[PDB]
């Protein structure tokens, strides 16, 4: 297991994919044009995990970029490291969804899907040990949610033995203009619970809260968040871009993380917290690093884990520090809060350490938390949704595009059983 | 029929079929198969002067349907500030009950539209009005996860 093929679609999804490829193309040492300008070979032992090699010291990001809006691609060309993308891999539609799921799933996405499948095909025809597929998108809009879920379904029925990883973001009436979002959300969840393997959850509400209270940015722009997400992405991909025994490939990653097939919704978190282009003079230590990255003030989804219990956790520390200090603080948080861990799964928190730190930091810490508290995030949507589907607003959009209307209440019964599933494994003692 | 065209006229958002259809004697408040007036549909999907020229042509500023929703239910829920301000300017209802027990403040609160709560409360919203599940309007904010909605409900 080595090669990971990456894909970005939708406004939000393409944006965050760009931020990702920026920070990781710098950390791996690739210059903007596409030649290795690093220092340490630690950045090339597992470089093949995210780049194909065009002969001649050309590191081509094994990636694909899609949108139903013909514009979008412009924001790519202005991306400072955007020329490195392979020409064939640019597949951009020209209709546009306009915040409509069924337009992206049953209508126009149904037309561009087979155009993406062929570039994905010729991407897999040149991979030694193709791991799985790794996607970035958003749930409240039109293109990303729908066309994404359809793509995942077709890849799933053509590649059943390859890991299915998705980095999905959340709508909330704090950043979303329109309010057609509590529909596309529940649809996307309906497909994700049934077709994906791993799934990372990022709430726009959390990023707004962090940008306002911590970073003191009263007027949050739309890149202020992409910074915050790209950081977490480097943190959780460290286990796959650098060598190490823990979380080698994605299969191993899900193995120590997925207790039940459906429950696979994580709540990332990073410490410390910084704005853009602002380094840390008093860079953080260790007890504040782990004392922060397990508190809620640094989590990436609007979910207070102190209400729920952790099923599994995978902590990752980057930089140069003491190993004993790491494992000691880990177990200290564990046993001083053994009331927050399912005692019927033991050895549930796995922590690795990587040498190379992220950019702008000397010591960092990433968090990945499959908690039982994540149901609070799904009890919110099934509230914005049951309050809008009991009224049937905007249903002529979807239903008037080949969609069944009951494929909605299907998703309400599905998610409302999921909530009961996270509540199930919250009070089950080891009897 | 001449009420159908007005119903889908204020729903699709138009200036012409709300100017010279009520001119032919079209039912200004003609409903459909469950009870939506062209004011529910002009306030709902996001249209302005259709609710200013409709609410001055005889539109009931408190009309209901099969489950009990009013034009303020269907404007505080979606999130159109000016349509709730104008719908309240004519004397709408801020404490209307429907078959599931929800009030327009519960719906503007659930959908996280906060200035609609800022004006729905200042125009007399009842924080002690409960629903089919026994939760007040201040009982939506502490279960949501939104502090900015619980700050306006305790002020
Ligand atoms: N953090 C962040 N959120 C975004 C961005 N773009 C869109 N969103 C969110 O995603 C939702 C849908 O917007 P959009 O991306 O245009 O829809 P889509 O591309 O069809 O999925 C909205 O509610 C936004 O809050 C972005 O660049 N950053």
The CATH number of the domain holding residue A81 is: 3.40.50.1440
Final residue before a domain boundary, out of A330, A349, A373: A373
Q: Of B69, B102, B111, which is closest to A179 when you measure between CB atoms?
A: B111
Nearest alpha-carbon partner for A230 in A318, A169, A297? A169
Query: ∠ CA(B13), CA(B101), CA(A307), 5° rounding?
Result: 100
Q: Taking CA atoms, what residue in A is nearest to B100?
A: A390
Maximal C-alpha separation, chain B: 51
Q: Taking CA atoms, what residue in B is nearest to A385?
A: B111
Report the first-to-last Cα separation within chain A, whole angstroms: 38
Do A198 and A161 share a domain, yes or no? yes
Chain A interface mutation, best of B42, B112, B133, B143, highest count of A Cβ atoms under 10 Å: B112
Do A310 and A225 share a domain, yes or no? no
CB contact under 8 Å between A383 and B112, yes or no, is: no
DSSP state of B3: S
Do A115 and A254 share a domain, yes or no? yes
Closest residue CA from atom 26 of ligand 1: A12
Q: How was this structure determined?
A: X-ray
Strands A198-203 and A269-271: unpaired
Q: What is the CATH number of the domain that holds A411?
A: 1.10.287.600
Do A266 and A332 share a domain, yes or no? yes
> What is the domain range of residue A361?
260-373
Contact at 8 Å (CB) between A266 and A368? Answer: yes
Contact at 8 Å (CB) between B2 and B24? Answer: yes
- The reply to whether B67 touches chain A by the CB within 8 Å rule is yes
3-state secondary structure chain A: CCEEEEEEECHHHHHHHHHHHHHHHHHCCECCCCCECCCCHHHCCCHHHCEEEECCCEEEECEEEEECCCCCHHHHHCCCCCCCCCCCCEEECCCCCCCCHHHHHHHCHHHHHHHHHHHHHHHHCCCCCEEEEEEEEECCCCHHHHHHHHHHHHHHHHCCCCEEEEEEEECCCCCCCCCCHHHHHHHHHHHHHHHCCEEEEEEHHHHHHHHHHHCCCCCCCCCHHHHHHHHHHHHHHHHHHCCCCCCCCHHHHHHCCCCCCCCCCECCEEECCCCCCCCCCCCCCCHHHHHHHCCHHHECCCCCCCCCCEEEEEEEEEECCCHHHHHHHHHHHHHHCHHHECCCCCCCEEEEEECCCCCCCCEEEEECEEECCCHHHHHHHHHHCHHHHCCCCCHHHHHCCCCCCHHHHHHHHHHHHHHHHHHHCCCCCCC
Do A276 and A417 share a domain, yes or no? no
What torsion, rounded to 10 degrees, do the Cα atoms B138, B143, B144, B146 define?
70
CB contact under 8 Å between B78 and A376, yes or no, is: no
- The reply to whether B149 touches chain A by the CB within 8 Å rule is no
Q: Which atom of ligand 1 is nearest to the CA of A207?
A: 1
CATH 3.20.20.140 fits B1-155, yes or no: no
Q: Which residue is associated with the tokens 């650098």?
A: A242
CB contact under 8 Å between A380 and B144, yes or no, is: yes
- The reply to whether A282 touches chain B by the CB within 8 Å rule is no
Q: Taking CA atoms, what residue in A is nearest to B102?
A: A387
Do A93 and A196 share a domain, yes or no? yes
Q: Which residues are A203's β-sheet partners?
A: A170
* A188 alpha carbon – ligand 1 mean position (Å): 14
DSSP state of B22: G
The answer on whether A429 is annotated among ligand-binding residues is no
Burial of A411 (0-12, 13-18, 19+ CB in 10 A): buried
Contact at 8 Å (CB) between A84 and A59? Answer: yes
- The reply to whether A323 touches chain B by the CB within 8 Å rule is no
Do A47 and A183 share a domain, yes or no? yes
Do A32 and A162 share a domain, yes or no? yes
Number of domains composing chain A? 3
- The reply to whether B68 touches chain A by the CB within 8 Å rule is no
Do A357 and A415 share a domain, yes or no? no
The tokens of A5 are what? 């093929």
Give the resolution to one decimal, in Å: 3.5
Output the CA–CA distances (angstroms, integers) from residue A8 to A87, A133, A194, A296, B133, in the order listed: 15, 11, 21, 28, 42
Contact at 8 Å (CB) between A186 and A381? Answer: yes
Output the CA–CA distances (angstroms, integers) from residue A9 to A6, A176, A247, A396, B139, in the order listed: 11, 18, 27, 25, 38
Query: What is the spatial distance between Cα A393 and Cα A402, in angstroms, rounded to a whole number?
Result: 17
Measured from the Cβ of residue A379, the count of other Cβ atoms closer than 10 Å reads 17
Query: ∠ CA(A396), CA(A401), CA(A402), 5° rounding?
Result: 120
DSSP state of B96: -
Closest residue CA from atom 3 of ligand 1: A12
Do A417 and A275 share a domain, yes or no? no
Do A168 and A193 share a domain, yes or no? yes
Query: What is the spatial distance between Cα A293 and Cα A194, in angstroms, rounded to a whole number?
Result: 30
Do A162 and A98 share a domain, yes or no? yes
């Amino acid at each position: 297991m080595r090669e990971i093929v990456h894909i970005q679609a939708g406004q939000c999804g393409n944006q965050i994919g760009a931020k990702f490829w920026e920070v990781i193309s710098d950390e791996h040492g690739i210059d903007p044009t596409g030649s290795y300008h690093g220092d340490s070979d630690l950045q090339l032992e597992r470089i093949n995990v995210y780049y194909n090699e065009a002969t001649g010291n050309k590191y081509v990001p094994r990636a694909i970029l899609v949108d139903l809006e013909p514009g979008t691609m412009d924001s790519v060309r202005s991306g400072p490291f955007g020329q490195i993308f392979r020409p064939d891999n640019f597949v951009f539609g020209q209709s546009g969804a306009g915040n409509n799921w069924a337009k992206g799933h049953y209508t126009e996405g149904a037309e561009l899907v087979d155009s993406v499948l062929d570039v994905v095909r010729k991407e897999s025809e040149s991979c030694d040990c193709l791991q799985g597929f790794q996607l970035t998108h958003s749930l409240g809009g039109g293109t990303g949610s729908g066309m994404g879920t359809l793509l995942i379904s077709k890849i799933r029925e053509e590649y059943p033995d390859r890991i299915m990883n998705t980095f999905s973001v959340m709508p909330s009436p704090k950043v979303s203009d329109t309010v057609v979002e509590p529909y596309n959300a529940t649809l996307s969840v309906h497909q994700l619970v049934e077709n994906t393997d791993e799934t990372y959850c990022i709430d726009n509400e959390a990023l707004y809260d962090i940008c306002f209270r911590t970073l003191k940015l009263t007027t949050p722009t739309y890149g202020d968040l992409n910074h915050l997400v790209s950081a977490t992405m480097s943190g959780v991909t460290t286990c796959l871009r650098f060598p190490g025994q823990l979380n080698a490939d994605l299969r191993k990653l899900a193995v120590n993380m997925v207790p039940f097939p459906r429950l696979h919704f994580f709540m990332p978190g990073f410490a410390p917290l910084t704005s853009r282009g602002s380094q840390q003079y008093r860079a953080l230590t260790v007890p504040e690093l782990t004392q922060q990255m397990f508190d809620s003030k640094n989590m990436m989804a609007a979910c207070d884990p102190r209400h729920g219990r952790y099923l599994t956790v995978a902590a990752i520390f980057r930089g140069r520090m003491s190993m004993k200090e790491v494992d000691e603080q880990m177990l200290n948080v564990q046993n001083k809060n053994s009331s927050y861990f399912v005692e019927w799964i033991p050895n549930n928190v796995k922590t690795a350490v990587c040498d190379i730190p992220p950019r702008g930091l000397k010591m960092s810490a990433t968090f990945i938390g499959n908690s039982t508290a994540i149901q609070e995030l799904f009890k919110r949507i099934s509230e914005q949704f049951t309050a809008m589907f009991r009224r049937k607003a905007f249903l002529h959009w979807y239903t008037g595009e080949g969609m069944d209307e009951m494929e909605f209440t299907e998703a309400e019964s599905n998610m409302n059983d999921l909530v009961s599933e996270y509540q199930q494994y919250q009070d089950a003692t080891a009897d | 029929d001449l009420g159908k065209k007005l119903l889908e006229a204020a729903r699709a958002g138009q200036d012409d079929e709300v100017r010279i259809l009520m001119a032919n004697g079209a039912d200004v408040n003609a409903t459909d198969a469950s009870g939506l007036t062209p004011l529910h549909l002009a306030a709902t999907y996001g249209h302005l002067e259709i609710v200013e020229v409709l609410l001055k042509h005889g539109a009931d500023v408190n009309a209901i349907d099969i489950m009990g929703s009013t034009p303020l239910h269907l404007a505080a829920l979606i999130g159109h500030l000016e349509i709730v301000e104008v719908l309240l300017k004519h004397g709408a209802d801020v404490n209307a009950v429907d078959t599931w027990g929800d009030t327009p403040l519960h719906l503007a609160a659930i959908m996280g539209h906060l200035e609609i709560v800022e004006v729905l409360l200042k125009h007399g919203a009842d924080v002690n009005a409960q629903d089919k599940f026994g939760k007040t309007a201040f009982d939506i904010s502490i279960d949501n996860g939104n502090e900015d909605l619980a700050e306006i409900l305790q002020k």
